[PDB]
Structures are given as C-alpha cells and as structure tokens.
RNA sequence: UUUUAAGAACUAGAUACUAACACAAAUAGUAAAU
C-alpha cells in the first residue's frame, strides 16, 4: 500500500512539456519546476541533489590525489594516508 | 496461453487499475477550487471488480462544492454539449480496462456500450445517475471516456490521460514486458554518498547449495540457510533478513522462488518503515533481481530503482565470521541488525572507509583464508562481539589496506597472464573500484 | 596401464543397472531385518515382548 | 477493572525490568510501563520538537494512540506486548541500540523478540501501523542521547 | 509423575562426597593416560547383581574409574565401589520404564538418564534429587552432557536436540542411535537409524560430513582421540579416524565374533573387547589385528587400572574380568 | 581339533564418475537440426 501524502514525481508538473520520468528506474533528472520560481522554495530535481553535501568533498581530496601523485598516494586505495595528507 | 501468463503475473492486471486510477486518485484528489470540489469520495474497491467483466459499478463520486450541470452523455473528445439539462453534486468515474482483438480495436463503441448499458442496469451500482466512463485498450493502448458533462474537466482529463498513458508504471511494465516475450528493443559514481537514503541487496548468499551422498552413487544438491544481505554504505546498520531452510521446504526450483521471495522481503521491509527511513534508491549487483523488486516495486512510484552500470564485488559477505555465525544459529526466520564498520565513523568519513572495505572483500574474494590470517595474525589485540573486522591501530588498518591491496594485483599478474609491470594506471583502478 | 585398469574391470561386470540395483535393495531389506530383530532382542533382554 | 487502578498508580516508573518481559502474572504491571515510557519519549520529543524531525512527530502520536489505549487496558496479546517490551526494553540501553533494532526486525517481520543482553506472531493493519512509529520513536532516542 | 528415591548404606560423609578421594586403591585415580603396556583378565571378581533384569548399561565415573553406574530396566539406577567392593553406594528411583541410557557430568557431580517413559532426568550424584525433568513427545534415545553446558538427545524420531530447546538438527532421516564427540566441544558423530554417519560443529545445525555405503549401533571413540570404532550389524567391527579425514581403513577389521553393544580400547590402544549375544568377551590385539583371547563368560552388552575390565549383560549381573 | 595379517607412520596430486549448483534467461523421455 502506497502513502497518499507524498506526490509521485510525475505528477509534480502535468504538462507533457515538463520534465522526462524515465518509468523504468524511476528518475526524474531535470526538475519538473522550469516555470515559476516558487514563492516559498519548494522536488528541486535529481541533478540538484547530486552535487550536495557529502560528495563534494570527495571530489576536492581527489583533486588534491591527482595532482599530489604527480607532485604518490591513491584516494581510492590507500585512503587514510592521502587523507590525513589533505588535512595538513 | 502461456506468452500471456507470463505477461500478467502477481495480478498485473489489478495493479494497473489501481495505479491508473488511484494515481487519478491523487490528480483530481487535488483539485478542489476551480472545478467546485467539496471532496474526493471513492468507494472501496472489492478486489475483483477490475478482471471481472459480468457488470461494473461506480467507481469514485465527485462530490460537488455547490452544484453541477449534466449535458446529455457524449465522449470526452465528443465537444459540443450544454450542461443544464441536470444538476447534481455527487459523481462517479467508470474506469475499465480490457485487451483488445483484429475485430474490436474501436473502443468508442465499447464505452458508450459498455457505458450505455450499465447505467440504464439494475445490478450496476450507482450513486447518481450521472457519471464519467474512462476505457482502455492494452492491446493498442487507446483509451476513452464517455460521461454526462458538467464544465471544465474535458482537458483535464484529456491532458491527465496523455500523463497516464505515457507514466503510470504499470503500463510501462508491460510495454517493458510484451517486449520481453516479442524480444523488439528498437536498435539505434561517488554520488552513492549523496543525502538520501541508498540501499545495497545482494543476493548471492540467499540459497546456498550444499553438496551430499547420493544413495547409490551421484552428486546430491541440497542448501543450508542463508539471509538477506543489505545496508546503507553510510549509517552502517546491517539488515539481515535470516532464511531458514525451512522455508523452501516443498516446492520447485528455488532459483526463481529465491528471486521471488528476495523481493518479497525486500519490499515488505520498505512498507514497514517509516517514510523518514525509507530508501530513494536501490542498488543491487545481480541483475536477475530486477524483475522480482520491479514488480513488487510498482506499489511506490516515489522509490527509483537503479541498477550497477559498473563491476562490483559484494559475495564475500559471508566469510567473515559473526554475522555468518549468527547465519548458522538461527532456528526460526528473523531480521538481525548490524555494524558494518566496526567503529570507522570517528577516524575517517565513511567514504575512505568504503575504500578499504572493499578492497578486504576482494582479498576475501581471490586468496581468501591468506587474507584471514593476514586480519587475525596476531589475535592479541581482540574483536569485540559488536566488531567484525579485526580492531587495530591507524598503521594497522594502514599497511593492511596496502597488503590485501597488493594480492589482487600479483596474484592477479601471476594468474590471469597478463603483467603487473606492464599495467596502466586506470586499469589498476578498474579493478581496485571493481 | 590405467586404461588397461578400465577394460579390464569392464569385462569383469555381466549385469547391467537394474540387477545391481536389486543386489543393493536386497541388501539393505536384510540390514532392516537384523536391526528389527536385535530390537526385539534387547527387548527380551528387557522381559517386554 | 484493575486495569483502571494500574493506569492511576504513581508508583509505577518507566523502567523495564527484563525478567518480567515474559511473566505470566506480570502482564498486566508491564503492560502500563510500556504505556508510560512511550509517553515519556514523546514528551522528550516534544520538548524538543524543532530540532528533530517536527513534520513527522503529529503522525507518529496519531498511530501509537491507539496501542497506548490497548496498553492502558491490558488489551494486548502475550507474544506482541514480549516483543514491544523487548525492543523497549534494549532502547533504554544507549549502548544497546542495536539490539533494539535487531528486537524491532523479529517484530516487523512477525517473529517473537526475546531480550537479547539477558517463536510467532500475527500482524494486523491497524497494528502495522503503531509498528511503523515504534521505529520512528527509537531513531529519536539515538538522536536524543547523541545531541546532548 | 511422583518421585521417591532410596539412599544406601550409612557411611554418608573431613566431609566429602563418596565419589572423591578414591585416593586409596592400590594404585592412583588421577594417574597418567598410559598405565604401561596393557593385560588381559582371566578371573572374574564381583556378581554385583540387585538387578533382577539384565543391566542397560554400565559407565565408570568422570575423571577416573572410581565409581561405576549401572541402568535397570526394571526402572532402578545403582552406584558401586568399581573397586570389587561389596557395597552399592546410593540408588535411584524415578523412572517408569526401563532406563536406556546415561551419562555424567565432566566435572562430575550431575548425571543424566533416558528412558522409554518419554523423560530425561538430571540428577544430584551426591543425594538422588532428580533435579530437573525434560519433555517432548518422542522417545530418547543415547543422551550425553557437553563435555564442557548443553544436553544432547538423540531422538527416535530423527532429531537430535540441545537442551539448556536451543538448538534442533533435524537433517538425520530414521532413528539416531549414538552420539560421540571426535574432538571436544568442536565436532561430534551422530550415528542414525538410516544407515549413515552425520559429522557436524558444535550447536550449528548443518553437517560437515556425510558417510554411507548395514548399521552403527554402537560407536566408541579412543583414548587417543585417534580412531572410531562401530559394531555393526553385518558382524564386523569398523575403524574410523577422529582427526580430519573421516575414510574406514581397510588395515584394521574385526570379524571373530557374530552379533547393540560396546566396543572399548585397552588403556595403551594395545586392545579391543567387544561384547556380543552370545555372551563371548573378544579380545583383540589392535596393533596385530587378531583376535588373541575369548571368554565364554555370561549364561552381553558394554564391556568397559590395566588390571581388569567391566562387563554386563542379560543376565543380571556385572563381572570383573 | 581350527587359526597367521609382513606390521606402523608420512605425503601428494593424477585419471575417472557425478550435481536442475554457477557463463536478454529462458529447455525435458511420440517427433529431434542446415
Ligand atoms: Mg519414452
């Protein structure tokens, strides 16, 4: 049984010209709110999420692996060396 | 008969009236204002009004603010109507579903057939005598309504249907399905760390086969228990779902009845928790399984299920001790929870941790018992019950990432037959990431 | 010498699957049958018949 | 109706003493602690209500209602209030989170949860869902416990 | 279900337990594992007899044979001197019908009994107090204690199960007949009414090892810890290996004699007795593989210092040999 | 009146047989294929 609250993704904006839901897995990407900035903020998309947070991060110490290994440590695979590296 | 059986299965059929029309449910759940609604009133649906085509009844009544104006009944794309010849406030849809043949392709004349015949019967149920019917085809997916009109929804609904017909899952199920049986496809990473909540199942350690004396002499198959393996690879708590072999007791082949009751544990365990704790995701590495959660997963349009683009390494769970030693205790089914990372949260991010976690799984997965004495050398520093891995020092975890590290890479040289020294940088990544 | 192992066990067996299976059935009915028996001796051994 | 004297005893606390959790004659006595300390976890909530999830506290109470009544009056079956008891029971444990959480799965999944530190069930509609919140409520207590 | 039992004998207790400070006879309890290059017996010592009906079984005492225990099928359980003393120590009384099979507690204070009645009893060595009774439909079958703390039952009705139920293993199809342990606490060997061996770890329900190729009634394991030995129907006894590779050696076989029953290793792995129907001890040389003595004693089943042997059987009575 | 097993320990793999167990995922005892 489904909760009645929380709106499936498709139907966030009806209009055919709104934002691709590809049925098969389940994601939009493009986020269904192209028209109207809303009042209040409001679904900003997928794509909005990605970047958020937790994974930025990753990607700076992994900047910082690249060019310190032609400056040899490997975020992947050895990770707490490199990373107490990027503290200092 | 059998091509078809398969196309509907675990009532497909049901299921997409229900996401049809109950996701309509919603759209004009909605609306209130400008068509002038009190409230969205449906009558519970008796399991088989959906398959079965003896008679209809009405399906959800439109209850109106104030007053409504009923036109003499025509087609939704049938236009010109004056709506004063009755006024009502409660409504209904008819919405029905049926799969068409070379003869009746033409819907129309089935609605207001159908429609027509209904409304004027007896047996059917109605609330008012006035109302909407919305038909389809699966067959060619066309699809219709004939109702008594009363203003302003005609492209409501028209513009919703173009939604439905081109969304609501379960459609997308069969066309995903037919193609399957008809085998027409037209021709021609780190973000697992984001905010919402991803899950990992792997299912390789679900029915385990179990080698026995034949009588006579041959080789017997048999299992022991297995669980269900799945966490989040941030918050680290392990959800095990024990599998008793109890369970496969009578019945076929357990390859199938495995993926089936995988999802089916899977999916009960998502409806139970809470709408906080629920995953955005799901991530699984056996694509066998796409099917079995896909089709229980139709009830939670919310939830995206995304698959592995990339090679991963995720059978090893098993041969790291509690957790299987929990494995083998078990006299009746249950969830157990877990730690996957012992206490790496202090230390590191979970990210690095992640790193090396899968790096110790394929040490596991390649040489395997080198790599347990390689973690329990030296005992004398101790596991707790709550740890899995054996505890260490920052130098420990350290140069053992760097020796479980480097077996896959010799090992590896030595015998696939291919050089170590001749290597590239971004295939020694591959393998490392996967 | 280890094919010559092979032929020179083939000739030595005449049946074919049913017979042995029956030599094997056979058998087993006459375990059955000691194991009863040795029961029903020990129950003696006991008094109760 | 004892069942109306236990519900005004004050001298009955919150704390669970697990080898009463599967006590014939106790019964009734754990019923009304088990009352008490989901009472006493919402109200830890509520003080607190901004800073942890406040959009889901409203539906958390509206769902334990009505096993609070059940609870109230000794209404629940033996193996159910064994089960809540335990998972109750371990929550009031901090360093014993996850044997709530281990307690919370038998539970969910039909299963009779014994403490775990110290065989089936039926699972009905109304029922799933004060099952559900009894999840949300043990996220809040690590919360809790974790922001102090 | 009502409960009486007996005490014998008023010698009671520095205060110490009969059981404990065997001490005294010629030679020590506590004594080293070889006590030289082994004998065996002509001359029988002790009738012991009180049974009227023929000994279930007969075990020494854990630790070192300073008491012996016998099983009455007329439902009765009798302590002795095992040191061809006259006096029988303390009896028991509990049981509705004949009592099957028994076994002690390591450390030695508790023992257990089986019997057809349906119940097994844990008992107080040093007063008689049935302690604790277990249920369960089924028939039990041989009973051993961990020989560290859990019950072991064979079931006839295929499970074996481990009592505090914690743990079932139903794998075994027909009835269990013996259980041992190869090595302590890690593994042991159930042995079952269908014609095979099942070998697993200890408390976890799956089986390491299956062997199958007429019957194991009765298996015993050597005081090295390195050989098994059944006696199956077929009349022959079987020698298996308690270390890893559980395969019957062709070197060693046992076919002196015809027949349930105990095989037993001299002290030293110089012998082996094994007691039959007919009531003829087999005396066998291990290491030569031959039968070296035979004793027509007994008008047999277990037969258990190198100096003598314990056997009893049908009759009634036990004998030292 | 019967009766002699050359005894014990160590070790490895090599040829075999097998197993509805594992490589968009599915086959069985009237018929089989350029
Ligand atoms: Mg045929």
Not at chain 4, 117 to 131: F, H, P, Q, S, Y
Not at chain 5, 226 to 241: E, L, V
Request: charge should be positive; include cysteine.
């Amino acid at each position: 049984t489904r909760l009645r609250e929380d709106k499936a993704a498709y139907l966030n904006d009806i209009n055919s010209t709104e934002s691709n839901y590809d049925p098969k897995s389940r994601l939009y990407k493009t986020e269904t709110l192209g028209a109207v900035d809303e009042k209040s903020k409001m679904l900003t998309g997928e794509g909005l999420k990605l970047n958020e947070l937790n994974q930025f991060a990753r990607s700076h110490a992994k900047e910082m692996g690249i060019r310190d290994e032609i400056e040899q440590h490997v975020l992947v695979a050895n990770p707490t060396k490199y990373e107490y590296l990027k503290k200092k | 008969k059998i091509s078809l059986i398969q196309i509907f299965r675990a009532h497909l059929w049901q299921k997409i009236h229900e996401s049809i029309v109950f996701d309509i449910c919603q759209i004009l759940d909605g609306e209130l204002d400008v068509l002038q609604i009190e409230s969205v009133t449906k009558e519970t649906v008796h399991p088989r009004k959906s398959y079965k085509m003896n008679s209809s009844a009405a399906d959800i009544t439109m209850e109106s603010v104030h007053e409504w104006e009923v036109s003499k009944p025509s087609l939704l794309h049938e236009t010109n109507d004056s709506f004063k010849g009755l006024i009502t406030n409660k409504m209904w849809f008819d919405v029905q579903l049926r799969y068409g043949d070379y003869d009746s392709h033409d819907i129309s004349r089935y609605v207001r057939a159908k429609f027509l015949d209904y409304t004027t019967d007896n047996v059917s149920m109605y609330p008012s005598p006035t109302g909407v019917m919305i038909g389809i085809d699966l067959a060619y997916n066309m699809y219709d309504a004939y109702g008594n009109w009363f203003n302003g929804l005609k492209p409501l609904i028209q513009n919703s249907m173009r939604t439905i017909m081109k969304a609501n899952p379960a459609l997308y199920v069969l066309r995903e399905r037919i193609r399957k049986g008809l085998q027409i496809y037209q021709s021609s990473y780190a973000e697992l760390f984001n905010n919402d909540i991803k899950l990992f199942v792997d299912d390789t350690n679900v029915y385990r086969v179990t080698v026995h004396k034949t009588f006579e002499g041959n080789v017997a198959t048999k299992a022991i228990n297995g669980c269900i393996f799945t966490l989040n690879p941030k918050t680290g708590h392990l959800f095990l779902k024990i599998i008793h072999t109890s369970v496969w007791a009578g019945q076929k082949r357990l390859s199938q009845l495995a993926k089936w009751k995988t999802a089916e544990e899977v999916s009960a365990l998502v409806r139970s928790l809470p709408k906080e704790e629920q995953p955005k995701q799901i991530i699984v590495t056996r694509k066998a399984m796409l099917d079995p959660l896909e089709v229980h997963m139709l009830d939670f349009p919310n939830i995206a299920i995304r698959p592995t683009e990339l090679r991963l390494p995720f059978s090893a769970a098993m041969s790291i001790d509690k957790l299987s030693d929990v494995v083998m205790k078990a006299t009746e089914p249950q969830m157990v929870l877990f730690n996957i990372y012992d206490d790496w949260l202090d230390r590191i991010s979970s990210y690095t941790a992640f790193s090396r976690l899968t790096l110790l799984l394929r040490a596991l997965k390649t040489n395997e018992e080198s790599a347990k004495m390689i973690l329990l050398s030296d005992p004398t520093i101790t596991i707790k019950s709550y740890h899995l891995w054996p505890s260490f020092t920052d130098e420990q975890w350290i140069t053992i990432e760097s020796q479980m590290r480097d077996l896959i890479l010799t090992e590896y040289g030595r015998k696939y037959n291919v050089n170590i020294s001749a290597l590239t940088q971004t295939e020694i990544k591959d393998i490392i990431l996967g | 010498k280890e094919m010559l192992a092979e032929a020179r066990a083939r000739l030595l067996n005449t049946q074919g699957k049913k017979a042995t299976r029956k030599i094997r059935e056979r058998m087993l009915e006459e375990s059955k049958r000691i194991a009863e028996l040795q029961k029903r001796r020990e129950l003696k051994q006991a008094g109760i018949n | 109706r004892i069942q109306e004297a236990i519900a005004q005893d004050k001298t009955i606390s919150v704390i669970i003493d697990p080898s009463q959790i599967g006590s014939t004659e106790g019964k009734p006595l754990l019923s009304m602690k088990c009352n008490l300390y989901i009472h006493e976890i919402l109200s830890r909530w509520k003080a607190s209500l901004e800073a942890y999830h406040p959009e889901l506290f409203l539906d958390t109470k509206k769902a334990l209602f009505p096993l609070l009544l059940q609870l109230r009056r000794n209404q629940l079956a033996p193996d159910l209030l064994i089960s809540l008891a335990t998972v109750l029971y371990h929550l009031q444990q901090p360093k014993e989170i996850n044997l709530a959480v281990q307690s919370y799965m038998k539970l969910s999944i039909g299963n009779v949860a014994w403490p775990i530190g110290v065989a089936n069930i039926m699972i009905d509609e109304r029922t799933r869902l004060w099952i559900t919140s009894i999840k949300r409520l043990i996220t809040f207590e690590e919360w809790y416990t974790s922001n102090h | 279900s009502e409960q009486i039992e007996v005490e014998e004998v008023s010698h009671f207790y520095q205060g110490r337990g009969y059981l404990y400070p065997p001490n005294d006879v010629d030679v020590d309890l506590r004594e080293e594992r070889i006590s030289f290059r082994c004998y065996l017996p002509k001359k029988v010592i002790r009738n012991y007899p009180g049974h009227p009906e023929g000994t279930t079984a007969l075990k020494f005492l854990p630790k070192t044979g300073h008491l012996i225990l016998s099983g009455g099928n007329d439902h009765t359980i009798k302590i002795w001197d095992f040191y061809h003393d006259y006096e029988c120590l303390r009896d028991f009384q509990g049981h509705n019908k004949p009592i099957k099979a028994l076994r002690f507690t390591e450390d030695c204070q508790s023992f257990l009994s089986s019997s057809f009645d349906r119940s097994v009893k844990i008992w107080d060595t040093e007063t008689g107090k049935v302690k604790t009774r277990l249920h369960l439909n089924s028939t039990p079958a041989d009973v051993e204690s961990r020989p560290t703390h859990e019950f072991i039952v064979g079931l006839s009705n295929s499970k074996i199960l481990h009592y505090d139920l914690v743990q079932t293993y139903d794998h075994h199809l027909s009835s269990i007949l013996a259980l041992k342990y190869f090595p302590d606490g890690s593994k042991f060997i159930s042995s079952s009414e269908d014609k095979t061996v099942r070998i697993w770890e200890n408390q976890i329900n799956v089986p390491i090892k299956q062997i199958s190729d007429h019957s194991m009634p009765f298996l015993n394991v050597h005081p090295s810890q390195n050989y098994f030995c059944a006696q199956s129907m077929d009349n022959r006894i079987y020698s298996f290996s308690l270390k890893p590779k559980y395969k019957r050696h062709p070197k060693k076989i046992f076919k002196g004699h015809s027949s349930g029953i105990s095989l037993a290793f001299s002290g030293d792995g110089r012998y082996i007795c094994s007691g039959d129907s007919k009531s003829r001890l087999f005396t066998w040389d291990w290491n030569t593989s031959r039968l070296l003595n035979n004793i027509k004693i007994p008008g047999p089943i277990t037969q258990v210092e190198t100096s003598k042997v314990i056997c009893s059987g049908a009759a009634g009575k036990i004998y030292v040999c």
